[PDB]
Design a protein around this nucleic acid. Structure first.
Length: 58
RNA sequence: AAGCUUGAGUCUCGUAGAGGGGGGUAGAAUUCCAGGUGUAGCGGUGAAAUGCGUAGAGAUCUGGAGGAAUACCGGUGGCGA
């Protein structure tokens, strides 16, 4: 069995899109998602629910 | 035609500063190169499409390549016709 027990999360929110990453302080991203990638476009790309399901999916 | 030090000009030890060149010193990501991580949409708009996509477009790591450009400090602060 192999677990990390420690992590780092980074949220980058703009008026174009919201990006969510889960990564390691000595490694690379092990989860990545976007609010546009939740199935919301144009005026909806960066909305609270579009990002709420992106963080959940990640 | 001789003076004067009062305009003009000169020397010591010192002074601020984006003035003009050349050589040094560095990074960022869009890009480009290779091998990995790894995916269903990506981009844009009031709303879309041309375009680009599972043959991995989109996103990203690691060591290399390249072109424009120099945040901070910097102040109703300086240099000069």
């Amino acid at each position: 069995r192999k677990q990390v027990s420690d992590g780092v999360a980074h949220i980058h929110a703009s008026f174009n899109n919201t990006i969510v990453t889960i990564t390691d302080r000595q490694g690379n991203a092990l989860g990545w998602a976007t609010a546009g990638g939740s199935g919301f476009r144009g005026s909806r790309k960066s909305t609270p629910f579009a990002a709420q399901v992106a963080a959940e999916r990640c």
